[PDB]
Design a protein around this nucleic acid. Structure first.
Ligand SMILES: NC(=O)c1ccc[n+]([C@@H]2O[C@H](COP(=O)([O-])OP(=O)(O)OC[C@H]3O[C@@H](n4cnc5c(N)ncnc54)[C@H](O)[C@@H]3O)[C@@H](O)[C@H]2O)c1
Ligand SMILES: [Zn+2]
Lengths: 264, 52, 213, 97, 98, 212, 50, 69, 99, 123, 109, 49, 92
RNA sequence: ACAAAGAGAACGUUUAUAUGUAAUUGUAUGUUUGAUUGGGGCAAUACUAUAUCUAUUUAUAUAGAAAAAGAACUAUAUUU
């Protein structure tokens, strides 16, 4: 990892004065010391890389608004922001200007760039059909837009319109309810579904680039699938195929006159 | 251990389902009074024991 | 060479001659579908011969059955079935779990219907759902079970409900595992579904590899 | 590990939202190529969950405050009824489900 | 321990301990003696919550007493005499989670 | 000889035996409590001193749990009356190696403490710091610079009650600890995991488009 | 003080037989529980007409 | 009768998993020790893995040289 | 007439180079010669000696005698362990069953 | 459960049973095991009500109580007695059902050829 | 025990009651070291199910001195090296010199 | 020598007439159990005629 | 027991044990078959630098196929005995 | 006991790797007298070892090794 040149020794005076095998050589507590110390000294030389684990993942398309991909995301964070969209939406693009002239234009781009960072990449990781991508345009475009596509090839625009008084910490939440609304509305207003039921069940994984720091989830791919495992207590399926008893349907209520009375 | 305790009183008389190997061929006059009084005793000796 | 593990399908043989001998003798009533309660309570078979699972009807030298005879037994032999079925009878092979074996022999201890669990998976493979024995689930299996969930794709045809909103592999390690498997096995049609390449050699996961149909 | 099913009733510390989180059936590490450390600490750890998360930090995501933390107090299900039965019918909509 | 409450023979016979094929509620109440037990099942209660105690806990229903509905064995035994009696079990059934 | 044999421990209820010893604080090993005060008073007496509304409060069955030892199963229903072995297990099982690594605990500093060697702050006043387990015990606590960061320590000082889960679980292996560091890095120092801190790198222009 | 005041090898009559039930055994106080007399076992089981 | 048609036999391209000349081959019971259970790839290796066990029972597969075994 | 048929002697150790038509005499269920039939089946006869009309114990447990133990007038009250519970499939428990 | 001709619930498969009312059966063996079973339920009530008649004055002091502890008698009534009534009822139906058929057979048969040969045809 | 690569958690045994020998002793609460017993008598699966631990205190509890919180001297049955002899030994806990500062009595103790 | 399958000499082994006509796909112990269920039918067809 | 190496009739030579005298003629048709074969003196001595080959009934295929020699110890169908795919001169 | 590791290593424990005649366990043969142990053959279709010699004359099982029909390792070569 570039820090694996641990000196196979350590300053510590060897306990066990006498003699024997295993003396004066590194310990797995000391091997983690030098690993951290010489990790920091790179992290000052800036040569230290964090794409050492994420070597198989296809390196995301670099772009100036697409820094959301190169971030190593905490798996305990992508669990919190569990956003889901209608499955027939193939992609989401969120473009926004670089510098925004009007004061309310800088408001929206803040929301876009926020939603470009906060809510877009969880949707990728959670839904895995959508190809979430964000690009920062370069001009005084005081309004960002969102291109919510769909599997049928159709698509819409979602003019990112936050209110002047609101913050951006909810301006996205509005935009969120402005996208996940459309996604179902587009997916409800689709044409014949037999085709998109094939593409969707053919669309490869779009979220491969996503870099998830599986923190305290490193035991086995069982817990790496912990966001797909979804407990469902009180599950309800009350539609039984009842098979009634046609032959001798009566005759349960007509027998064993218990201990025949005085007449018989 | 398990000794068929659900059979102690579930016999038709008092001398039944009580294992008494101590028998004899001819139980005499007072050995028979001793016997009949015996079966009922360890039938009421058992009960009021188990009731107390 | 003849071991009996926990769950073996080894029946005690009730020769059809015995059952046919009784029905005329008068121990068994030909009207009432002769479930194993009647056989046990009429002293046709004792306690020392009904060990789970119940019995097996064997057409032993019985070249003919004269009257329409109805039976609810466990795993009749194929000839014994085609003998009752010729004389207008029936044979609906009940293959009850052990919990069902009790509540059929001593129902005077179960005042109400205490629900019965379906038999072991090994039994459902061979008797309970197999129409060759007219197992009692050969109606249900084709009617309700053999159909997948109305949302399941190709990979999740066996889950009670498709665990994803899309048939395809969910995450990377479910994918690269299936991207390697489908070319680990030479590219077969269904080889997409990753399978464990180690055979436990258990008797439960054993179903008739060769046999009649 | 785990072999038997059990559902706990975890009480958050931030909102005290008594949410229940179960523990499914996760099969034993393979005995065919046995490994003494991974097994005997799978088992000993299993008594520690089976006794209501004795020596473990509980890490499940809340349902009320949507976030994952480690602040849950594992309620034995007669300390839960002590709590559930003693909440006005409106706060049962607030803290319970 | 100089005195053991029970010899190992009865630390190792779970049949006297577990609830398996063994009734754990002795008294069988009448019709009106149940409609007067369920009167104290409080509103907000649901059988879907009182769980099965583990094996290591004895199977003992001390009967219908104060807060009997939390005794998992008293609850599901009363719930069963309400069947043989015909009383209408309002509360929910054991929801086997999946 | 015993003049005045003491009365049973928790005999305070009028028509039910006192809970077994051990549960009240005494000697374990016996399941069923019994108090000769209760068994001698005839039945009508026990029904005199009590009304029906009360017996339903002391009949009360707290079935698995114990009403007294809060959080532990009632010791008249366990396999044997001793305390639950499983909950109070010794930290080392019968075979494992003692590789319990160095653990750092949270302490509430009580005076603005300022190191003169790193020239920075061990800790501000009234802020909880994760310090070594043998700095705290040996250097921070004996002098009055710090105390532990327990729940009640917060209560005594005037701070919003925070649950650090101080030693809620000890890790018996380094990599079993370096997972616990990842849990505690999330709950305690949460600002590390905001969408704003994962993007200090990018709050403005991607650096390749700025001046020089 | 709650203990019984003799080495329990002398009072082993109580610990192994079916006196394990008829006796208080809390912290080795081998003292008899309450026990009805036979004038009462029938006074309490006839008044019920059992 | 019903004119329904079914073949005479089911041909499965499956291969038998018990070869008479292979040692641990067979169909084992659902609770027998699966093929080479506890062995860990070594001859009688489940013995060598006993010292590795954390704690064993008081009566645990001890010394027993096959004498009149 | 109860043979105790046993498999071939040399069927796993050394195969390469042995005769071509004797590498298969190892495959038949041959009887063991009666001089050993009587030795091994001697430990089974002892079950009730001097009773000239009880047959020897069998090698495998025949299906009717297993129940013969629980077909005794004293076992009629053990619902469990009757009608075959060991050789039954593994019991099924409450989904909450736990130890 | 089976135990009568109604078919156990294992007619989940809708196995019908046609060609019925086909057999006159005198219920010979079943009436035998009824008189045997009716003797048990009465031979059980005799036990459930055994009450001390101590013909001796030594242990006369229980001459009013039942011969079984109240908890046990309260069990044996429910374990063995009330079971034996169900087992008696079962035969009280497997016969009351089979008679219903015979009542129908012995009419449709009496007509055809003879009311004299009839109880010879069914002899 | 199942053989698939990725076994997602589930309510019940997905493929029937878990097969294998060691799954047989876990299905009854025992620990996986029961697989190494030669005799599993009704006392044995009692002995090793840890109903009541075979584990005691070095001195009398009424006369104990060093603060043993919840510990015993549990005996660890070891099986020896190449020739597997079974021997057992009593393993203690690790007592440290607890040199604390109880600020009640403003001094180390 | 050092062969395993000596040519068909006079031995009444499995139905070699049907060992030729059968899919090699199936394993052995599942073939010799299936050339018989083929032959078992060829025996019924012959008896009926 | 000791006595690990026997001493009565230590045979001069011994055909089965010689650097490659017993060879598993595994089938070139990667059906996993093998037919253990001791190289005779015609190949015991290195008359063959080439790895032995023979035509033998492949009992699986029921066809005479090649038998390339190979050490008798080893898995006989490894991921090296996969043949690269090829489109046959048949088909459209 | 020696060494490793873990505890800001305040000292007691637990491990791992090691196995000490300080270690008290068990083996240390059998047959003819000190050598021999195998399967054949010639010596009246006798064979004590008699007398001679030969040689792919083969080392059964159980765990591992080879997973289709095919296969390896070793034991006074009946082999506790
Ligand atoms: N293998 C078995 O478990 C088994 C065997 C024989 C009988 N049973 C039947 O089980 C029934 C009880 O149900 P379960 O098996 O779930 O266990 P259970 O006995 O715990 O059932 C709950 C409770 O129902 C009550 N009850 C049972 N039968 C009753 C009756 N006839 N009238 C009134 N109350 C009654 C008892 O209090 C019992 O404890 C009994 O009626 C019994 O005859 C079960
Ligand atoms: Zn919360």
């Amino acid at each position: 990892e570039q820090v694996q040149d641990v000196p196979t020794s350590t300053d510590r005076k060897p306990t066990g004065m006498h003699r024997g095998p295993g003396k004066r050589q590194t310990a797995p507590k000391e091997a983690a010391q030098y690993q951290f110390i010489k990790k920091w000294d790179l992290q000052m030389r800036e040569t230290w890389d964090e794409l050492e684990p994420f070597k198989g993942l296809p390196k995301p398309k670099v772009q100036f608004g697409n820094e959301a991909a190169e971030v190593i995301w905490p798996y305990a964070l992508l669990l919190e922001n569990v956003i889901k969209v209608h499955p027939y939406t193939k992609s989401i693009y969120v473009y926004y200007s670089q510098r925004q002239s009007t004061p309310l234009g800088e408001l929206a781009a803040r929301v876009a760039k926020r939603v470009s960072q906060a809510y877009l990449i969880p949707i990728t990781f959670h839904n895995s059909h959508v190809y979430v991508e964000a690009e920062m345009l370069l001009e005084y475009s005081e309004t960002p837009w969102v291109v919510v596509h769909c599997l049928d090839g159709t698509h819409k625009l979602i003019p990112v319109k936050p209110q002047a008084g609101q913050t951006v910490k909810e301006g996205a939440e509005e935009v969120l309810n402005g996208i996940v609304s459309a996604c179902n509305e587009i997916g409800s207003a689709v044409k014949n579904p037999k085709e998109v039921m094939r593409l969707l069940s053919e669309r490869p994984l779009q979220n491969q680039y996503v870099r998830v720091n599986y923190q305290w989830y490193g035991d086995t791919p069982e817990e790496r699938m912990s966001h797909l495992v979804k407990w469902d207590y009180e599950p309800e399926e009350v539609v039984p195929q009842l098979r009634n008893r046609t032959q001798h349907v009566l005759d349960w209520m007509n027998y064993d006159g218990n201990l025949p009375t005085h007449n018989s | 251990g398990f000794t068929m305790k659900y059979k102690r009183g579930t016999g038709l008389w008092d001398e039944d389902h009580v294992n008494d190997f101590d028998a004899n061929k001819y139980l005499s006059a007072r050995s028979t009074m001793r016997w009949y009084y015996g079966m009922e005793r360890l039938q009421t000796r058992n009960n009021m024991n188990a009731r107390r | 060479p003849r071991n009996r593990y926990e769950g073996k399908a080894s029946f005690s043989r009730l020769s059809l001659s015995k059952l046919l001998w009784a029905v005329d003798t008068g121990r068994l009533n030909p009207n009432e579908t002769i479930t194993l309660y009647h056989l046990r309570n009429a002293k046709v078979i004792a306690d020392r011969e009904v060990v789970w699972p119940g019995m097996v009807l064997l057409a032993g030298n019985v070249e003919r059955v004269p009257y329409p005879l109805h039976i609810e037994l466990q795993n009749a032999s194929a000839k014994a079935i085609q003998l009752l079925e010729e004389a207008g009878g029936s044979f609906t092979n009940v293959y009850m779990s052990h919990e069902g074996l009790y509540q059929e022999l001593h129902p005077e201890e179960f005042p109400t219907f205490m629900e019965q669990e379906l038999p072991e998976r090994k039994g459902l493979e061979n008797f309970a759902t197999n129409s060759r024995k007219r197992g009692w689930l050969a109606q249900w299996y084709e009617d309700e079970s053999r159909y997948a969930h109305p949302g399941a794709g190709r990979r999740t045809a066996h889950y009670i409900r498709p665990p994803t909103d899309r048939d395809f592999p969910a995450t990377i390690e479910e994918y690269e595992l299936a991207k390697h498997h489908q070319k680990w096995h030479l590219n077969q049609p269904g080889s997409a579904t990753v399978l464990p390449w180690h055979s436990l050699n258990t008797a439960d996961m054993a179903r008739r590899s060769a046999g009649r149909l | 590990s785990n072999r038997f099913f059990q559902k706990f009733y975890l009480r958050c510390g931030n909102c005290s939202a008594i949410q229940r989180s179960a523990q499914g059936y996760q099969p034993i590490a393979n005995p065919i190529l046995f490994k003494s450390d991974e097994h005997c600490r799978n088992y000993h750890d299993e008594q520690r969950r089976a006794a209501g998360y004795s020596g473990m930090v509980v890490t499940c995501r809340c349902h009320r405050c949507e976030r994952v933390h480690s602040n849950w107090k594992v309620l034995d299900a007669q300390q839960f009824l002590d709590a559930k039965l003693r909440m006005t019918p409106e706060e049962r909509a607030q803290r319970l489900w | 321990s100089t005195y053991n409450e029970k010899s190992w023979l009865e630390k190792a016979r779970w049949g006297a301990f577990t609830k398996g094929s063994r009734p754990v509620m002795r008294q069988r109440y009448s019709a009106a003696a149940l409609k007067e037990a369920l009167e104290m099942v409080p509103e907000g209660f649901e059988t879907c919550d009182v769980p099965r105690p583990p094996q290591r806990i004895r199977a003992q229903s001390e009967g219908v007493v104060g807060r009997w509905y939390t005794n998992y064995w008293t609850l599901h035994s009363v719930r069963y005499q309400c069947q043989l009696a015909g009383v209408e079990w309002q509360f929910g059934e054991r929801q086997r989670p999946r | 000889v015993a003049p005045w044999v003491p009365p049973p421990r928790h005999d305070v209820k009028v028509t039910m035996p006192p809970p077994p010893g051990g549960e009240v604080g005494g000697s374990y090993g016996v399941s069923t409590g019994y108090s000769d005060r209760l068994a001698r008073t005839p039945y009508w007496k026990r029904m005199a001193l009590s009304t029906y509304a009360l017996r339903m409060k002391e009949n009360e069955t707290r079935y698995p749990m114990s009403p007294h030892r809060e959080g532990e199963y009632d010791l008249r229903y366990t396999v044997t009356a001793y305390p639950d072995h499983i909950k109070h297990r010794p930290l080392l099982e019968i075979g494992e190696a003692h590789q319990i690594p160095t653990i750092e605990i949270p302490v509430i500093f009580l005076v603005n403490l300022w190191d003169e060697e790193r020239l920075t702050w061990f800790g501000r006043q009234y802020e909880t710091v994760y310090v070594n387990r043998n700095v705290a015990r040996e250097e921070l606590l004996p002098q009055r610079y710090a105390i532990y960061a327990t729940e009640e320590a917060y209560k005594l000082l005037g701070l919003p009650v925070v649950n650090h889960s101080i030693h809620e679980e000890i890790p018996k292996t380094p990599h079993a600890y370096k997972k616990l560091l990842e849990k505690q890095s999330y709950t305690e120092e949460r600002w590390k995991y905001t969408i704003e801190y994962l993007f200090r790198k990018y709050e403005a222009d991607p650096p390749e488009l700025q001046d020089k | 003080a709650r203990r019984v005041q003799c080495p329990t090898e002398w009072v082993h009559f109580r610990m192994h037989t079916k006196d394990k039930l008829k006796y208080d055994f809390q912290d080795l106080a081998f003292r008899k529980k309450f026990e009805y007399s036979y004038e009462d076992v029938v006074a309490n089981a006839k008044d019920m007409c059992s | 009768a019903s004119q329904r048609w079914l073949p005479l036999q089911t041909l499965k391209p499956m291969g038998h998993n018990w070869s008479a000349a292979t040692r641990s081959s067979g169909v084992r019971g659902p609770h027998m020790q699966l093929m080479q259970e506890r062995l860990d790839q070594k001859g009688f290796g489940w013995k060598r893995k006993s010292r590795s066990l954390w704690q064993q029972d008081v009566a645990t597969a001890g010394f027993r040289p096959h004498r009149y075994f | 007439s109860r043979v105790w048929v046993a498999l071939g002697g040399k069927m796993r150790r050394r195969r390469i180079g042995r005769q071509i038509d004797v590498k298969d005499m190892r495959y038949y269920w041959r009887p063991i010669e009666p001089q050993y039939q009587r030795l091994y089946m001697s430990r089974l006869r002892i079950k009730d000696h001097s009773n000239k009309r009880v047959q020897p114990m069998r090698l495998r447990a025949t299906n009717n005698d297993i129940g013969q133990a629980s077909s005794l007038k004293e076992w009629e009250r053990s619902s469990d362990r009757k009608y075959g519970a060991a050789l039954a499939p593994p019991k099924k428990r409450d989904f909450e069953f736990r130890v | 459960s089976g135990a009568v001709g109604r078919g156990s619930f294992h007619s989940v498969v809708a196995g019908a049973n046609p060609r019925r009312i086909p057999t006159y059966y005198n219920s010979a063996y079943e009436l035998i095991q009824l008189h045997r079973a009716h003797r048990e339920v009465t031979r059980n009530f005799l036990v459930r009500d055994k009450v001390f008649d101590n013909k001796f004055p030594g242990c006369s002091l229980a001459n009013g109580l039942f011969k079984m502890v109240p908890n046990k008698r309260g069990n044996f009534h429910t374990r063995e007695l009330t079971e034996s009534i169900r087992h008696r009822t079962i035969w009280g139906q497997r016969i009351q059902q089979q008679r219903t058929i015979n009542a129908a057979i012995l009419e449709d048969a009496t007509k055809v050829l003879s009311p004299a040969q009839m109880e010879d045809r069914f002899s | 025990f199942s053989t698939f690569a990725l076994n997602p958690e589930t309510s019940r045994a997905p493929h029937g009651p878990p097969r294998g020998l060691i799954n047989r002793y876990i299905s009854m609460g025992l620990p996986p070291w029961a697989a190494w017993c030669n005799r599993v008598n009704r006392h044995a699966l009692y002995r090793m199910s840890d109903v009541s631990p075979r584990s005691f205190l070095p001195k009398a509890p009424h006369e104990m001195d060093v603060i043993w919180m919840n510990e015993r001297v549990r005996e660890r049955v070891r099986t020896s090296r190449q020739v597997q002899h079974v021997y057992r030994q009593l393993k203690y806990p690790f007592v440290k010199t607890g040199i604390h500062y109880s600020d009640t009595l403003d001094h180390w103790v | 020598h050092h062969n395993s399958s000596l040519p068909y000499a006079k031995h009444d082994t499995n139905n070699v007439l049907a060992m030729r006509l059968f899919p090699v796909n199936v394993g052995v112990r599942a073939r010799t159990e299936a050339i018989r269920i083929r032959t078992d039918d060829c025996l019924q067809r012959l008896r009926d005629a | 027991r000791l006595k690990k190496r026997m001493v009565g009739f230590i045979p001069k030579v011994i055909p089965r044990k010689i650097r490659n005298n017993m060879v598993a003629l595994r089938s070139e048709a990667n059906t996993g078959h093998m037919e253990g074969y001791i190289k005779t003196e015609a190949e015991r001595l290195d008359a063959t630098g080439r790895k032995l080959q023979k035509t033998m009934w492949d009992p699986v295929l029921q066809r005479y196929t090649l038998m390339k020699e190979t050490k008798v110890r080893g898995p006989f169908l490894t991921k090296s005995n996969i043949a690269r795919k090829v489109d046959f001169p048949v088909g459209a």
